[PDB]
Design a protein around this ligand. Structure first.
Ligand SMILES: O=c1[nH]cc(F)c(=O)[nH]1
Ligand SMILES: [Cl-]
Length: 225
């Protein structure tokens, strides 16, 4: 029970100012969900976690759909799990197969993507909560304006940005991001169902670095332990 500035990093609090009202609304929605006896993921204190790393250092945004639907998996950073979670969700296993294929680094030891978030990657979902076992259950309930505002804010900075958009809902952001300082990469989602359609082979990590370097920005260090 805090205002924006307390929920997110200082730069993000400034960026998300237009949606402070909407964030408060979403808190009221989630309260109502609990009152009704429906659950949501991730934990309340993690819902805005992706915005707890500096808005200024963001260079890449990875965007997915909505949080993992299995309790114990979603932690407020898209695609990430806690470092003691295994087996990994299949989407993450597929992401890590593409990581090794693209970059040649060893398979990660765990599924925690916190290093990426600490290095300038925004790990966003288009929708920031979900009911358990019910993927896409909070689509259309008010998060989209919040995540739109985030993206537009990033795209408005006088800095290079690369977006990696995984799946259909993320793909909706592409036109928003398209001024000349912003470059979006789009592919099918890494989940098993969709990955065969073009996630594998997409080389998003090396491509995003080629793009950053070509715009004069530092590349991302993608290495995971
Ligand atoms: O954070 C997420 N986990 C799983 C997904 F499939 C997705 O889109 N985002
Ligand atoms: Cl529920």
């Amino acid at each position: 029970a805090r205002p924006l500035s307390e929920l997110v990093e200082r730069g993000w609090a400034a960026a998300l100012e237009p949606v402070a009202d909407q964030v408060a609304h979403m808190g009221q929605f989630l309260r109502a969900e609990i009152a009704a006896g429906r659950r949501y993921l991730p934990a309340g204190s993690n819902v805005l976690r992706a915005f707890t790393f500096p808005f200024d250092n963001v260079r890449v945004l990875i965007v997915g759909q909505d949080p993992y639907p299995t309790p114990g998996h979603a932690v407020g950073l898209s695609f990430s799990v806690a470092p003691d979670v295994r087996p990994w969700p299949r989407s993450l296993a597929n992401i890590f197969d593409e990581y090794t294929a693209d970059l040649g680094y060893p398979l990660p030891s765990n599924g925690d993507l916190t290093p990426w978030a600490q290095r300038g990657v925004l790990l966003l979902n288009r929708v920031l909560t979900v009911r358990p076992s019910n993927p896409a259950s909070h689509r259309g309930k008010g998060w989209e304006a919040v995540t739109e505002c985030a993206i537009r804010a990033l795209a408005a900075r006088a800095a290079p940005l690369v977006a990696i958009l995984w799946g259909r809902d993320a793909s909706t952001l592409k036109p928003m991001l398209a001024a000349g300082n912003c470059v979006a990469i789009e592919s099918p989602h890494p989940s098993p169902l969709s990955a065969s359609r073009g996630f594998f082979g997409s080389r998003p990590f090396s491509r995003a670095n080629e793009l950053l370097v070509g715009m004069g920005a530092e590349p991302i260090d993608w290495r995971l332990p």
